[PDB]
Design a protein around this ligand. Structure first.
Ligand SMILES: CCC(=O)Nc1nc(C)cs1
Length: 171
């Protein structure tokens, strides 16, 4: 059985208990914390690609109102985000299982852009999600996994200074 675990959940949970925020920019900003995933149970000899996308956790616009994030009352449907390919892809199971799979090079943007960068909507809440795609073999297979601990709101600047302080403390 394929097992997927979040590395450094301790730390992600401190961010989550404050409501996490991630900066987006026109050129694209790397994430802190970085999503790092522990994977066991792959076929060491099989070929896999690791994909990352961001699910819109709800259909609302969020605003920081007197020190608290509060959703709007005008939901719209959220078009799915684009998919980031881990740059190690494609690779052997052995490769993926020998150390945490670290998405350190994904950049989050607010503007339709060349590529690589993943466009999010500012002030929407997102739940990171990976797809593990068995490639090249006879049977294509996909295993997906969400990381609730890693939820955040996309922001053009930090609103909650407690988030600002944690980001600096741990970076
Ligand atoms: C799952 C398919 C896959 O790995 N796609 C890739 N495309 C590029 C360009 C690198 S890996």
């Amino acid at each position: 059985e394929l097992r997927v675990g979040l590395e450094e959940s301790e730390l992600w949970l401190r961010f989550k208990e404050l409501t996490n925020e991630m900066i987006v920019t026109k050129n694209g900003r790397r994430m802190f914390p970085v999503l790092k995933v522990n994977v066991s149970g792959l076929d060491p000899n099989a070929m896999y690609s690791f994909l990352l996308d961001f699910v819109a956790a709800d259909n609302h616009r969020w605003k920081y109102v007197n020190g608290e994030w509060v959703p709007g009352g005008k939901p719209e449907p959220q078009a799915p985000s684009c998919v980031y390919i881990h740059p190690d892809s494609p690779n052997f199971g052995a490769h993926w299982m020998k150390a945490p799979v670290s998405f350190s090079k994904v950049k989050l943007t607010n503007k339709l852009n060349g590529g690589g960068q993943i466009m999010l909507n500012s002030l929407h809440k997102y739940e990171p999600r990976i797809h593990i795609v068995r490639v090249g073999g006879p049977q294509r297979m996909i295993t997906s996994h969400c990381f609730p601990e890693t939820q955040f709101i996309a922001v053009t600047a930090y609103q909650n200074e407690e988030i600002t302080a944690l980001k600096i403390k741990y970076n």
